[PDB]
Amino acid sequence: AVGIGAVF
């Protein structure tokens, strides 16, 4: 993720 997002 570009930051905090999908875990993988």
């Epitope: 993720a1 570009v2 930051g3 905090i4 997002g5 875990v7």
Partner: antibody, heavy 121, light 110 residues
């Protein structure tokens, strides 16, 4: 493009912290993750949870799952946080954040300005 | 703190410094590492994502790397305007949460 948390304030112990983040320059329904992240006095950062714009699915930091709810409002293009049964331990700066566009010249993720919520009698 | 960081690291101007982030096999070993910079009074800013990618507008003196259960932020040609707090960030499978490191305070000497 731009995220703005609601106004700062006082919450009495045991009551419910309630925040909203107004989004402009993009749709709250886009395929992005809308997070709440707080920073305590002492500078420790904690991820509270997020809601996915496209589905409304949520994930919460497991210790908080019984206290927290994150929601989306399409009419106002905004998302919100509710943290109940709050105590002085929840005094912190609260940020709304969205993950960045996945292209090579991305600017990064997008953070609000943060809003101080202080829990006090 | 599941990601341990040196509380303070200092360097002389123009030098190269490395900020460390020590994790476990339930986070840095398996999931991407992000690096955030926080200047006084401001929100954290994404410097590195996915172990080693740099967004447009972050100076190329910053670079990220990962190996095993450890990750690193590297600053070349150190400048005074790099004094800030630096946090690493990763996802922890056993806690099921996105987590932040304890933070490293960087001071530019002299």
């Amino acid at each position: 493009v731009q995220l703005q948390e609601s106004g700062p304030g006082l919450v009495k112990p045991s009551e419910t912290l309630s925040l909203t983040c107004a989004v402009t320059g993009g749709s709250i329904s886009d395929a992005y993750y809308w997070s709440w992240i707080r920073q305590f006095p002492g500078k420790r950062l904690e991820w509270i949870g997020y809601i996915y714009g496209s589905t409304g699915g949520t994930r919460y930091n497991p210790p908080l799952k019984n206290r927290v709810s994150i929601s989306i409002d399409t009419s106002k293009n905004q998302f919100s946080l509710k943290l109940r049964s709050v105590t002085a331990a929840d005094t912190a700066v609260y940020y709304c954040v969205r993950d960045g566009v996945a292209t090579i010249e991305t600017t990064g993720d997008h953070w609000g300005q943060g809003v101080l919520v202080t829990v006090s009698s | 703190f599941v990601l341990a960081q040196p509380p303070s690291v200092s360097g002389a101007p123009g030098q190269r410094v490395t900020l460390s982030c020590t994790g476990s096999n339930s986070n840095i070993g398996v999931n991407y590492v992000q690096w955030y910079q926080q200047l006084p009074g401001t929100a954290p800013k994404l410097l590195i994502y996915e172990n080693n990618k740099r967004p447009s507008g972050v100076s190329d003196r910053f670079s990220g790397s990962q190996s095993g259960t450890s990750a690193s932020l590297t600053i070349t040609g150190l400048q005074s305007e790099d004094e800030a707090d630096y946090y690493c960030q990763c996802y922890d499978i056993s806690l099921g949460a996105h987590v932040f490191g304890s933070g490293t305070e960087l001071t530019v000497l002299g």
